[PDB]
Amino acid sequence: KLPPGWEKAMSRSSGRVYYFNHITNASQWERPSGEPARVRCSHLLVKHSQSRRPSSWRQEKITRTKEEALELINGYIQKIKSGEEDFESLASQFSDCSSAKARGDLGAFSRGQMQKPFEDASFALRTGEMSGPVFTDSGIHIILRTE
Numbered sequence: 001k002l003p004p005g006w007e008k009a010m011s012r013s014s015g016r017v018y019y020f021n022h023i024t025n026a027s028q029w030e031r032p033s034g035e036p037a038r039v040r041c042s043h044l045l046v047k048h049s050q051s052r053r054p055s056s057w058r059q060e061k062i063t064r065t066k067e068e069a070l071e072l073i074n075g076y077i078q079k080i081k082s083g084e085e086d087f088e089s090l091a092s093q094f095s096d097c098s099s100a101k102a103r104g105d106l107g108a109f110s111r112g113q114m115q116k117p118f119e120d121a122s123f124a125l126r127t128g129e130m131s132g133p134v135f136t137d138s139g140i141h142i143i144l145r146t147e
């Protein structure tokens, strides 16, 4: 009996159980703690060549592959989790969304407004929690639920 979307798994490298959320792609060692009309989220977007618009304020022509975008996302998540970098800092510097200029903040939103995988992950995140890689037609997202 775990919160929405969580399941038990076993580490291949360590053998210790961990928890994975199939809506948010979050993964963690600790057992998860546990819906509002609106949530507030920030995100860091890494676009790729198959993004709906392969262009951003960082790059007129985004040419990186989906796999390359995912590896960038993976490295940002690693540095956020290690404390080496802050989400807001990486979003401001590297997000391919115009919300980079607001440290990735998108403001508050309801169901029905965002692309569905983004929405589902946002609403399955607890306040303060961060997603793993979330895939949409825009690219690949790291989502931070702030409210």
Ligand SMILES: C[C@H](O)c1nc2ccccc2[nH]1
Residues within 6 Å of the ligand: 082, 083, 084, 085
């Ligand atoms: C103080 C902060 O937690 C932090 N985490 C780090 C990870 C790698 C290198 C430097 C780092 N500084």
